[PDB]
């Protein structure tokens, strides 16, 4: 009755047919690592961290937007799921500057819990790392686009939910600013919200921006307050 | 240290106070943090 | 290079004096509230901005493994200087 | 693979494997979980019954001597209904081989005294009976060690904090120490620190 | 040895040694704790934690610090059920409150669909 | 392998025995103890000449916890709460506010040297090497509000000396 | 559901414990208060021990019963030696107050606890 059997690790089970084999892998509990998919907009490919080897292929595919054949096995625990992971970790910590002591995502990076948690001990490419001039985007958002790692979620998140259309990428190769071109201030509703979309301590608050750091706080319970949703 | 004496930075003391306890001049601890939480003023004009 | 309190007394490099209507004042009775009084945001402006003929460069200070670590920073504020936030200190660029 | 990795011995593996399954065909009465680890040191999972018949077939039988005895900790574990564990070990002088008893245990039905079978377990039961509240059943002398005396609570539980209930200090109006409720100088941050993104796969256990 | 035993509550707040005010004033929240959305990752999900209620915590004048008296304030306790967390929440004795459980509701999304035709959903920038 | 001690037998030859019984008789080795501690006694005593000559040290001391600053510059530290995530007594107590510049900075660094065990994961935890665990050893403190130090309070302890501090660290910056 | 009961039965036992050990804590009060040299007379004493028994006077399960009966023995096989000092036994009593009434209005004064 509509429902297609993927066998992720030799365990089978029953997907909906059309959907992606991410939402598979965290139907049976798996974490697929992601940095360019989220589950409130639409999927692009942009990141390729999702990667898994599917079997009978010599092809590693991606699976943040793959549509689900029939009868599938799912590898997410193979040797070259882990060579693909540890070489796109390697190649996405290049031309990111140091700034963990002072970026203000020092607990709540992506990053920093994937490399651990998937990438390699060693690092490489002794010379470049290049360097964006920041922009002013508003004094609500504080904003250093040298960590931006051009994964195409600020601009998603603008154009598909705040409707402003004010945010792009520019240029080719390595040098892919994403911002906005006229100097203007962007101003709009919603736009605190894009400071927890940016995965990377690129896009941080700009009167909390150095005043503490999340592994001391506490995290309590509430209710939203002066709106009538909550 | 008639080899290498100095060094090249503008800030270490022509004095070196010694250990200066048990005097009228040591330290005491305090917070070095402005104001908390900005009590509020009352408005010295007057109604009635 | 420090202010003074009305009170009487030095204030810190951050403005943390007390009011007239405390008694911390009255627990610096006696011993002296040290301060140093060599601040940090003074320091910088006595720095030459070095102008460096380049577009982007990189900044360790003063020492290889003896600072802090490599910031590559760039320099295409035309009238703006580039900033590294551990050196604290600027530049600026001369094709 | 072959540095930076301590190697494992199959041998051994399949030594304390035969071992464990001999004896757990053989005491089919109390004997629920065999378990041998990756690095090759036996469990032995057991009802909280037969803890005196397995000690004394435990120090005996000339198949196994383990007349050595070690540490007795009953690690505190909610989400349990029966909480405790009472983790005997034990040492052969002539094989060299460990094997770690833990029989479960409640809060409140007694562990029957291994005390009258190993004497080194005297202090071990009355330390663990102040300390956590596992009784022991016909014990000679039970007592509080490594607590005040007028202190309880059974402080190496989970339900009992960091800091205790109690906090001393001198005073010259009853002239001697007394006790009053805690007070502390600083919050001690208990700070988070479980993050996310599962670090080992291997170990997913089955959701519901 | 197989004896006359009843099958009831229990009462372990008279053993647990913690006095009146602090087994019946404060009471005990069991939740979920909740994705920390900077990041997104559900490992640190799947765990049922029982917290107490905070309480004051004021100015030590001499350091500028946060003490506290409150002992029970920095408990946590991980379970793996809501059941036995709610047994557990009324073997030991405190009152408390206990919240339910949510999920991310499972959605269809598909590439195919965000480059569509007549509809109104496109991406209008990739 | 194995070298066990006490596995004779007192002897029946009668110079043997009357060897023992001569020594049981006549105090003999207990005179010998003597003559031991006598060529003790005759040696010059190791004691050093403690308010004038010190005693011997380390490259790698762990003292006086001096903070440290840039050649001809502003003050190392960041706020960046390494040292109090990794401070095994908790005895690190952080506050950061940014200033006018931009950079980011602090307002208030405590340090309990009551509570402080001394261990050196602040000094090897620090990625710009601002806190560093200080040369010398001479706390001797009267009162006990003046071991709770504060920001000021170790950095007039870093500008009371930092070639000292230069000097070790320039020595052994190799080894960690 | 079986569970072995640590010495009693029913509450019939239990009730005959716990009364015994009452018998005991009563002929135990004045040779503590010649051996320590205490400061307070024996029927203020003899009232606390009256009270901390009836503190838990509501308690059914046999098996905590038993339970309190052997705590209240080793207290007073620990008291009835010479081990537990003058400091243990004044800390039983309550005389460092810790005034906190249980009204609404001085708990209101000195607030936040409800
Ligand atoms: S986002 Fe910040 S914390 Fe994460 S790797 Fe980049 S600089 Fe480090
Ligand atoms: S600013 Fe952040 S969200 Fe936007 S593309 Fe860059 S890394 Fe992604
Ligand atoms: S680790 Fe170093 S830079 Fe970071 S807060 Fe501590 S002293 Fe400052
Ligand atoms: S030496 Fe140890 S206890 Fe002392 S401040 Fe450093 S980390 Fe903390
Ligand atoms: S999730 Fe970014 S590539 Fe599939
Ligand atoms: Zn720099």
Redesign the pocket.
């Known amino acids: 009755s509509n429902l297609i059997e993927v066998f992720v690790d030799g365990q089978s089970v029953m997907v909906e047919p059309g959907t992606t084999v991410l939402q598979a892998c965290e139907k049976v509990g798996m974490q697929i690592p992601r940095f360019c998919y989220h589950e409130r907009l639409s999927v692009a490919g942009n990141c390729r961290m999702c990667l898994v080897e599917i079997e009978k292929a010599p092809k590693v595919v991606a699976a943040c937007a793959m549509p689900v054949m029939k009868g599938w096995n799912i590898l997410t625990n193979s040797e070259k799921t882990k060579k693909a992971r540890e070489g796109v970790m390697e190649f996405l910590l290049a031309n990111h500057p140091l700034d963990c002591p002072i970026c203000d995502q020092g607990g709540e990076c992506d990053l920093q819990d994937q490399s651990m948690m998937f990438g390699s001990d060693r690092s490489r490419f002794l010379e470049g790392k290049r360097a964006v001039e920041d922009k002013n985007i508003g004094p609500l958002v504080k904003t250093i686009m040298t960590r931006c790692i051009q994964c195409t979620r600020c601009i998603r998140f603008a154009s598909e939910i705040a409707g402003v259309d004010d945010l792009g990428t520019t240029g080719r190769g390595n040098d892919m600013q994403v911002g906005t071109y006229i100097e203007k201030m962007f101003m709009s509703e919603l736009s605190g919200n894009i400071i927890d979309i940016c995965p990377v301590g690129a896009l941080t608050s700009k009167p909390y921006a150095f005043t503490a750091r999340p592994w001391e706080t506490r995290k309590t319970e509430s209710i939203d307050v002066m709106d009538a949703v909550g | 240290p008639t080899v290498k004496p100095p060094t090249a930075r503008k800030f270490i003391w022509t004095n070196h106070k010694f250990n200066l306890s048990g005097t009228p001049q040591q330290y005491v601890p305090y917070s070095t943090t402005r104001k908390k939480i900005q009590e509020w003023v009352p408005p010295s004009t007057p109604y009635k | 290079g420090v202010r003074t309190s009305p009170t009487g007394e030095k204030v810190t490099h951050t403005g943390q004096v007390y009011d007239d209507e405390d008694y911390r004042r009255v627990r610096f009775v006696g011993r002296q509230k040290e301060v140093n009084e060599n601040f940090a945001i003074d320091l910088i402006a006595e720095q030459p901005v070095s102008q460096v003929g380049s577009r982007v460069i990189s900044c360790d200070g003063g020492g290889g493994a003896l600072g802090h670590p490599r910031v590559y920073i760039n320099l295409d504020k035309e009238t703006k200087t580039g900033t590294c936030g551990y050196c604290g200190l600027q530049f600026r660029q001369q094709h | 693979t072959r540095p930076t990795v301590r190697p494992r011995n199959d041998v051994a593996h399949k030594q304390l494997s035969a071992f464990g399954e001999y004896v757990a065909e053989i005491l089919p009465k109390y004997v629920q979980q065999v378990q041998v680890s990756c690095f090759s040191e036996l469990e032995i999972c057991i009802h909280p019954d037969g803890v005196i018949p397995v000690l004394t077939f435990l120090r005996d039988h000339s198949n196994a001597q383990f007349k050595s005895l070690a540490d007795l900790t009953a690690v505190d574990i909610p989400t349990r209904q029966n909480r405790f564990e009472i983790v005997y070990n034990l040492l052969s002088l002539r094989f060299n081989s460990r094997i770690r008893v833990k029989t479960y245990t409640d809060e409140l039905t007694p562990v029957e005294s291994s005390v009258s079978v190993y004497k080194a377990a005297n202090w071990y039961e009355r330390e663990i009976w102040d300390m956590f509240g596992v009784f022991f059943a016909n014990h000679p002398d039970l007592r509080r060690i490594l607590t005040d005396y007028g202190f309880e609570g059974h402080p190496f539980r989970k339900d009992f904090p960091l800091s205790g209930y109690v906090e001393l200090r001198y005073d010259d109006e009853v002239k001697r120490v007394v006790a009053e409720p805690v007070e502390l100088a600083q919050e001690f941050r208990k700070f988070d620190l479980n993050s996310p993104w599962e670090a080992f796969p291997a170990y997913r256990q089955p959701p519901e | 040895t197989q004896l006359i035993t009843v099958d009831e509550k229990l009462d372990i707040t008279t053993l647990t040694g913690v006095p009146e005010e602090h087994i019946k004033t404060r009471k005990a929240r069991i939740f979920v704790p909740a994705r920390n959305n900077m990041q997104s990752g559900v490992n640190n999900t799947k765990k049922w934690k029982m917290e107490f209620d905070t309480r004051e915590r004021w100015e030590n004048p001499l350091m500028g610090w946060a003490s506290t008296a409150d002992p029970l304030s920095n408990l946590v306790l991980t379970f793996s059920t809501k059941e036995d967390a709610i047994a557990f929440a009324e073997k030991n004795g405190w009152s408390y409150d206990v919240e339910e459980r949510k999920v991310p509701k499972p959605k269809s999304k598909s590439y195919g669909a965000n480059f569509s035709w007549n509809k109104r959903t496109r991406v209008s920038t990739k | 392998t194995y070298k066990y001690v006490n596995l004779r037998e007192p002897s029946m030859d009668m110079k043997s025995v009357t060897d023992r019984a001569a020594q049981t008789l006549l105090w003999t080795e207990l005179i010998r103890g003597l003559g031991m501690t006598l060529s003790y006694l005759f040696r010059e005593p190791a004691t050093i000449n403690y308010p004038f000559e010190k005693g011997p040290l380390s490259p790698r001391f762990?003292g006086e916890?001096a903070l440290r600053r840039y050649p001809s510059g502003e003050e190392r530290c960041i706020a960046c709460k390494l040292?109090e995530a990794?401070?095994?007594?908790?005895?690190?107590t952080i506050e950061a506010e940014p200033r006018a510049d931009g950079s980011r900075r602090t307002t208030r660094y405590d340090?309990?040297?009551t509570?402080?065990?001394?261990?050196?994961?602040?000094?090897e935890?620090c990625p710009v090497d601002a806190?560093v665990?200080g040369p010398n050893f001479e706390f001797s403190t009267e009162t006990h509000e003046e071991l709770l130090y504060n920001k000021e309070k170790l950095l007039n302890n870093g500008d009371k000396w930092e070639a000292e501090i230069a000097a070790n660290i320039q020595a052994d910056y190799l080894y960690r | 559901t079986s569970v072995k009961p640590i010495f009693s039965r029913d509450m019939n036992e239990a009730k005959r414990r716990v009364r015994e050990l009452y018998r005991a804590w009563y002929r135990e009060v004045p040779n503590t208060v010649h051996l320590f040299q205490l400061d307070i007379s024996v029927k203020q004493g003899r009232d606390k021990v009256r009270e901390m028994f009836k503190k838990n006077a509501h308690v059914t399960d046999p098996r905590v019963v038993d339970l309190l009966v052997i705590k209240g023995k080793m207290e007073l096989e620990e008291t009835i030696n010479v081990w537990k000092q003058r400091t243990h036994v004044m800390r039983f009593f309550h005389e460092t107050e810790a005034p906190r009434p249980k009204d609404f209005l001085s708990k209101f004064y000195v607030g936040h606890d409800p």
Do not use: L, T
């Open positions: 762990r916890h040292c990794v401070c095994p007594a908790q005895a690190i340090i309990d040297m509570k402080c065990i001394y261990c050196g994961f602040c000094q935890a806190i665990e």
